[PDB]
Design an enzyme around this catalytic site. Sequence first.
Site, short mmCIF file in Angstrom:
data_model
loop_
_atom_site.label_atom_id
_atom_site.label_comp_id
_atom_site.label_asym_id
_atom_site.label_seq_id
_atom_site.Cartn_x
_atom_site.Cartn_y
_atom_site.Cartn_z
N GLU A 1 -20.17 6.54 -97.79
CA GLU A 1 -21.76 7.06 -97.36
C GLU A 1 -22.92 6.63 -98.62
OE1 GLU A 1 -21.13 10.63 -95.35
OE2 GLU A 1 -19.03 9.79 -94.28
N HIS B 1 -23.29 11.79 -93.83
CA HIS B 1 -24.66 11.07 -93.91
C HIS B 1 -25.36 9.28 -93.03
CE1 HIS B 1 -23.31 13.40 -96.77
NE2 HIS B 1 -24.39 13.51 -97.24
N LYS C 1 -23.29 19.39 -92.17
CA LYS C 1 -24.19 19.41 -92.51
C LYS C 1 -24.48 18.00 -92.22
CE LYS C 1 -25.91 16.61 -96.84
NZ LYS C 1 -26.07 16.41 -97.90
#
Lengths: 256, 253
Positions: free
Chosen positions: B94, B151, B178
């Site tokens: 990521e 991400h 997140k």
Amino acid sequence: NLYFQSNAMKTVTVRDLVVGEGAPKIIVSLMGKTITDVKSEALAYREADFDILEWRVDHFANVTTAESVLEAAGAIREIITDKPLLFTFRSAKEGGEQALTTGQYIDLNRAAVDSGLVDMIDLELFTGDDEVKATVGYAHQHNVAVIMSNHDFHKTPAAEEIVQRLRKMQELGADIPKIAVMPQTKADVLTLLTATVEMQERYADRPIITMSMSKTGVISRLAGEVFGSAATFGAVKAPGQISVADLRTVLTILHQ
Amino acid sequence: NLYFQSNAMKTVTVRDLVVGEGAPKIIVSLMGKTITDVKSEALAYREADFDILEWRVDHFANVTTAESVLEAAGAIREIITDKPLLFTFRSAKEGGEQALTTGQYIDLNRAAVDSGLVDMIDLELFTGDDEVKATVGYAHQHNVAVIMSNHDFHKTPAAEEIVQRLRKMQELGADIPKIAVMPQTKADVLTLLTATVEMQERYADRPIITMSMSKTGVISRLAGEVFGSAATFGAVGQISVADLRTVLTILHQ
Ligand SMILES: [Mg+2]
């Protein structure tokens, strides 16, 4: 009276201000009832960091007297001598403070075009196609630009419909298509941004102005440089307006 | 260690900071290679106006030496005494600066939890379900909060996929889901905001953090109060921490 426009960079240049380039331009509105009220506001606005001065003529008590409108326009132009002045009678149908027949509304705008004191006029898209076309022609013949407008103060139309309206404004010769809509949900704000992006990408060959109203839609007044709205309204001087000083701060922070 | 959380207003409270309430919070990151670099960064950030300090451990040269990592966490904590400290090793997959085996990554996070020096750890959604479940449990048993992350530095998934990832993070026990994604077009930024709204209104029972990366996605860093993201990242095209607070304050009213 002379303005320029380019379909390369999609700009309209009036009084040295290039609308459609760089950061979104700040429009502030004069709302005075009397000539002296209009002067008090103009004097108070003269220091503020705004780009375009809009006169909301529907707030003016003597709008039906030709000589009085001309006198008030003359008073504004002598206080704010170098910024573009936009003449806007918001119709009762679209939330304006007074009512005028279609005939009177057109005559009012033609008189503003004739005065030589205003750089731009606001014409409502749904005034009537024949009347709109006629008035756009007249404004253009006198080197006065047209902001063509549409407002929905209670809901947000589908993105496709918003796009359709902006396209029709271009079809009708608007120098700058303008639409303001009211969100009922957070998704509605994103719908207005979607329409702005799509219009800019697929059909725009000139600057466009778009806004989602209320506290919920305030991001639409800030993110024009990325999403494609060329101007934004601020108050010098509800809970859904943003001050000119704060708007300028944000636009500068976001400027690329 | 001690943190609170409430599904009423959907908040996590760590070291007096209420994440999920009011204006979005600002996270700043330490990127230093050495303990000396990390100390200098922390000293420089100490008088900036931010809410959570993130230590990007994947930037740390001595990450494979357990005592070195602990000494560096200790050094940061001596300097930043009052703010929550988030321990984040961004994996190679990521976009992280170094590579560790799954086992090493889990051992590193467990050691962070054990130190008592960090308030929160970042665990990646796609680490492996067994490992994620075990590590969330371990963190929670030691009163350490978990920000679960994902991400995509090259594209924006479909809105439904963004929502699905955020929901999965909740299911796995994340205290704060997140996600950060990269827009390839302007519409992609709006897709991230759409997913944020959908997630927060329909499924979230805790704070979520979302972001569309690059200059094109800056609006996702500013409009969290209305759309639903609880925090944003800044540094002391990119907008500074000072400017971030200015704008967030303006939008809070
Ligand atoms: Mg919240």
